Amino acid sequence: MNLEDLKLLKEAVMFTAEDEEYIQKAGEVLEDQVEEILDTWYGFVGSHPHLLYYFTSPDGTPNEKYLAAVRKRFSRWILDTSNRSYDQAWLDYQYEIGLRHHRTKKNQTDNVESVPNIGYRYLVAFIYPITATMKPFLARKGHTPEEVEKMYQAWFKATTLQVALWSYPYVKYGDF
Amino acid sequence: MNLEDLKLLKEAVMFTAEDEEYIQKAGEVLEDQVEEILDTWYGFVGSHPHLLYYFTSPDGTPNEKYLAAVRKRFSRWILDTSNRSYDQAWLDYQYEIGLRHHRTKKNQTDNVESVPNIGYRYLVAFIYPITATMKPFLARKGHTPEEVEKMYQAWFKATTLQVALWSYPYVKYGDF
Ligand code: HEM
Ligand code: HEM
């Protein structure tokens, strides 16, 4: 996609200049608390065997080196999402994040042997737990509940926007 | 999909028996305000030419009979989502709703001529506006702010859960 297509997708998730201010604020509050955000996030993935599965070795046990490498890139993604203006380099990388969940690129970044593809049903599903994970963190620090709501809404839009972008390599050609 | 697989998907959106109580409450609140919801929902769609596009005749003008027919089924959907328990018949219908946004069955239920396919990027994107539309209505029936937030979160889960199920015909065979 280019920036014209992005503008149309942003309109569909109701993402505006107001959300670019509040996603920067969310980022500020989240970057503060990244270590326990990560513990929360991997604790949810880790508590369901059918989810933890996508990180496992052939023998069905978690590949700890894979989990470690991914945790680092997840923590970087929290900051990337929080910036003032999504540009073409950002868009190009969103494609890359989707290719990495999909069989096209999964397991190549870390050079691991793991399951070949993340079922698309779960990438969509994960919009919810991603927003649910951040919510209590956004509510910490020192902000009003009205500011907290706008940060949370901003976060929800950005996550939805991104997953829709990540879905490209999964979708039958011409149906995206 | 069978009910075993729906259970795993419900786990991925954090949908539990607690969400079953509050989705029913959310449905109670929403159905008594349905006509207002529908006008709000179709004002959003109708206000963006690139979204209104999906309801238009080849000559570019909105098919009014198409819009009227879809609006009645969308109305049933608000109620169907608030069921006690999602059963096999419910699951089978979700496949159908997905087929109908997709080129597979689009335009066939109302026997209309319109654009052949809704691009998948927007089905994911609409998770946000769907939840954003419902939110002020859930606060309008004299429930505690705690129950309002619980109804809102359950709506968000059920919406995310359904779109994931509707993705099936759009996803490359074997990657779902
Ligand atoms: C809302 C949905 C999701 C978000 C926001 C998210 C976030 C991310 C991020 C930021 C990365 C690193 C991308 C990079 O290389 O820079 C990643 C990779 C990864 N995620 Fe997700 N993720 C989502 C869905 C899922 C699901 C459903 C699973 C299943 C457990 C999963 C498991 C993985 C795995 C195994 C990788 C490594 C892929 C590889 O080998 O490169 N993710 N995710
Ligand atoms: C969260 C996302 C969405 C939800 C919850 C939703 C809801 C629904 C429902 C309940 C129906 C009727 C299903 C039935 O036949 O019983 C429907 C059909 C339809 N929707 Fe959506 N929708 C979504 C995404 C979209 C998008 C992005 C568009 C683009 C404008 C759209 C436009 C249409 C059209 C044109 C139909 C008629 C399809 C046909 O010819 O049968 N929907 N939708």
UniProtKB/TrEMBL annotation, chains A, B:
User: Which molecular-function annotations from GO does this UniProt entry contain?
Assistant: heme binding; metal ion binding; oxygen binding
Q: Reply yes or no: does the keyword Transmembrane helix apply.
A: no
Q: Which residues bind heme b?
A: 66, 73-74, 93, 100-101, 107
Spell out the InterPro entries in the cross-references.
Answer: Globin-like_sf, Globin-sensor_dom, Globin/Proto, Protoglobin
**UniProt name for this protein:** Globin-sensor domain-containing protein
UniProt keywords, alphabetically: Heme, Iron, Metal-binding
Keyword DNA-binding in the entry? The reply is: no
* Residue ranges annotated for the Globin-sensor domain, each copy included: 4-173
Q: Could you tell me which SUPFAM superfamilies the record lists for this protein?
A: Globin-like (SSF46458)
- Which species is listed as the source? Methanosarcina acetivorans (strain ATCC 35395 / DSM 2834 / JCM 12185 / C2A)
